[model samples]
Target: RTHSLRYFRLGVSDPIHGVPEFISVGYVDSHPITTYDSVTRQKEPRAPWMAENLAPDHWERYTQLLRGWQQMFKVELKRLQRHYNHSGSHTYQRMIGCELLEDGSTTGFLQYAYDGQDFLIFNKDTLSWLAVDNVAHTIKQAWEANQHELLYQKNWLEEECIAWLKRFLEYGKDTLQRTEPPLVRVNRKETFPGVTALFCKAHGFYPPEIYMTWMKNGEEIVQEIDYGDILPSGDGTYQAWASIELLYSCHVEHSGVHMVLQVP
Candidate 1:
């Protein structure tokens, strides 16, 4: 499994903090060459983006590269979004396929095998094609593709495209061996009680923690909130559980939880 080579533009509204807006280039070096089969039996180019048009410059060349990358990303993202949003009465999973056409020529295939949250992109070109049957390999391909475009190019890299590509490849080398984060699954029923108990049990100057309050139909109610406890596993690993209750039949449009950890 490996991260793909991504491209993007970075800018900042503030000069002190130094954050820039980056438009990701969805050019995964890991994708297998599906469209161009005849151009095989070749030596891998030293730099994937190493071409005549990729000359270094302060403003003109850089802006041109950024513009081209932005266009590519916008088109691809829209294509995928539209395909998924097309409602259809079907039980089976739908495979969304998109081809990037550069001046009437097909650049490559972006096939998405989305199973709700996790997705797999079958590489026809870049990352060493471990057979499609290999679940690990498929997962690696999709994760790497997203990481390259979203995390590496969009967030981590500066305005320097070359440096981003270099770092991406270096990180991709050890992606397969990287350990995944521990799963944190919390159910409302179990967690509500547990988190409350943990908070209560904490001994201090106060005897016991007060019971948490809940709201029902826009009215406040004094209720006992129950939550699951955070306990250490036999292997010394820890798992935490917590939950919150809703009062009314509240319709949630969208929800997501994201955690970021930094390594030195």
Candidate 2:
């Protein structure tokens, strides 16, 4: 129901052998699409469509830009340690993204966390920062005091984030936009005399969004349905089933169409 762009970043206050202290990843529709880390010292596409859509120089420039980010992450990570008084080991995180909605509008967020707890939230509508604690309040004031930085970040949230979301969606339209109708099956088992279990199953659907229920005598028997759940079949598609003690009609919403299968 929503298309989104996301980049989640983390900086560790201490480093271990061969492991990166800084990490960043971008996602389109909750799937990892781009990756960068201090270990690799490079930015690269994780999805084939992402690699195919962007120009070669885009990676070249983005890799260097992410190098700068890694530097900032190190600086910021140490800054937190300074405030917290000594650091044995600590974690700092930042999540920045935009959500593209059905109404052709967008909502954006830039959030920061320390010690795995939310510490700062940038709300662009008012250009204000939400602080979680006294330390965060101090950081928030510092952020708001820089007028130019605040404006720049507001524009980044609204303009850059939204545009990137749409761009990524366009680039990955083949997988993100494709839809396949489900294959349906029905079966019944007699539990005892005068009792039967009626079931309807649908599987191998793309997009993984389905509506299934039971119907009887022109009424939707929503409460009577049980064992109705959607699950992945490990083959890049989805499956779901609905069952009831009895069934008059198994009604489903498939690709915005009415699909009704009846008991024999």
Candidate 3:
């Protein structure tokens, strides 16, 4: 019963040749969600949300919704451009989001910018003064006449969003089940005749949390161990490595050394 709407802005230095880059984008939902970029073909997950498979129809409907908003914002942007009287001198980016919670509560926000500078913000929940560069003013007289119409548009968008959420949840299954542990490997290298190092590497791990330690004579050696951060393997899994240096004297005392991985 949770639903949300999002928007993104692409900016470019040279609209004709330079590729557009995302300046900022945001969405409001029951929980934070990830989005996949169609052009870059990249998936960036924000916060945490369940992963799901979205069908083609879902993409079509979602695109339609976004297109509707884009059209509205395009008109608004033209108006603001005229008001500011700066043509082709600066680029603009804007973002907005709305949410409808399961408890029947609604919330929304709006932001508009010109040349990376803030221009306006409208909070639907409060519906108070429109904030323009830190100065508050009531809705423009021209816009005040169409306030009801604007509210109608908002309501329609919210209803459509709710419907989309219902459909999405039906198809999107939870990605919360436990996965297999990583494959771990341990190796030893002799830097010199009397100096050696024990290396432990792990790959294909899920959940990404792991611990490694060096042991001598069946006892854990907590000192002089170098542990690396767990890093993604560019796939769905993760990898990590840890190492410890040992002298030949210490190796003899401990009768050789070993490495242990604590993965859960």
Candidate 4:
């Protein structure tokens, strides 16, 4: 003979005072509590369209653009050299003046020194160094060649890479938008404080987008948090982990909460 057994699940609290109890309909079969591995063990799959979505035709065209850009850079470099020699001390003033057009604020030159032995002088900042070497070399070469232009043309030797980048940017927009959405796990524990870990293997996921938040009595906990870099899984997908630190006031709690949320 056999016997039929029944089980029950319940929610502890209800916001509406009139409601008596929350009912959960599910079966508890033979199972074990799952242990977790490090986030490094989770390997999220790369998006399916990642490789195919980039256009090959456009990719080739992009490479050509880079080559052309490099050629233009070389020509421009030559022009700058020619202009520098014609301006006399005005060139130095212009160089200094150009600094004002920069995106960052300019401080006056911190330190300048010249050594007589070699044809070079250096301008240095607190931790940065700039050396102007053999300033007379371009002038001497032009004089020997009887070329009035002191400037050497600048060529864009790196144009191929640039073209590829531009094309990649344009083509990448759609691919990026059509991403395999990130999966989120919560309240994970890692070796360090404010650090939460994740593992994808339990869910057969990889390259997961990992994040964390703190909780007090089951509500979203808000405070400062620090993050860590994603580590590779050594397989097809990547493993990432992150963490956050909560304020001192947020830790104390009663009536713990449970959640089952999914992300695409």
* Candidate topping TM-score: 2
Clash pairs detected, candidate 2? none
TM-score-wise, the better of 2 and 3 is 2
What is the number of backbone collisions in each predicted candidate, taken in the order shown? 22, 0, 0, 18
The CA lDDT of each predicted structure is 0.32, 0.85, 0.53, 0.29
175-255 per-residue lDDT for model 3 (tens digits): 222354767767778897998777777777754556555566656676687877878786657788777776211111111
Candidate 1 TM-score, C-alpha based = 0.21
Show model 3 residue runs off by greater than 4 Å.
1-4, 9-14, 20-78, 87-89, 100-106, 126-129, 134-140, 154-158, 175-264
lDDT of 4 by residue, 111-157 (tens): 11222122212132222223344554443344345322212111111
Each candidate: RMSD: 19.6, 3.7, 10.9, 26.4
Quantify how close model 3 is to the true structure by its C-alpha RMSD in Å.
Answer: 10.9
Model 3 is weakest, by summed lDDT over 10 consecutive residues, at 247-256
Per lDDT, the best of the predicted structures is 2
Instruction: For candidate 2, write residues 1-264 as lDDT tens digits.
Output: 578888999888777767679999998874689999988888999999999999999999989999998899889878878877866878889998888887787898999999899999998998899998887898899889998988998899889988888888888888887878888877899988888888899998877778888888778675667866678888768899988884388887866767888886
Q: Which digits, one per residue and each the tens of the lDDT, describe model 1 over residues 1-264?
A: 223343212221112433222222233342221110011211122333233223444234544554564445334434444445643221111122232222332222233333233234434345322333355354455556664553332222233433444444454434322332444322233355444211211111111111222334655434544444444443423344332443321111111223321111
Off by over 4 Å in 2: 15-18, 183-203, 209-234, 239-264
lDDT, residue 216, model 3? 64
Q: Candidate 2's C-alpha lDDT?
A: 0.85
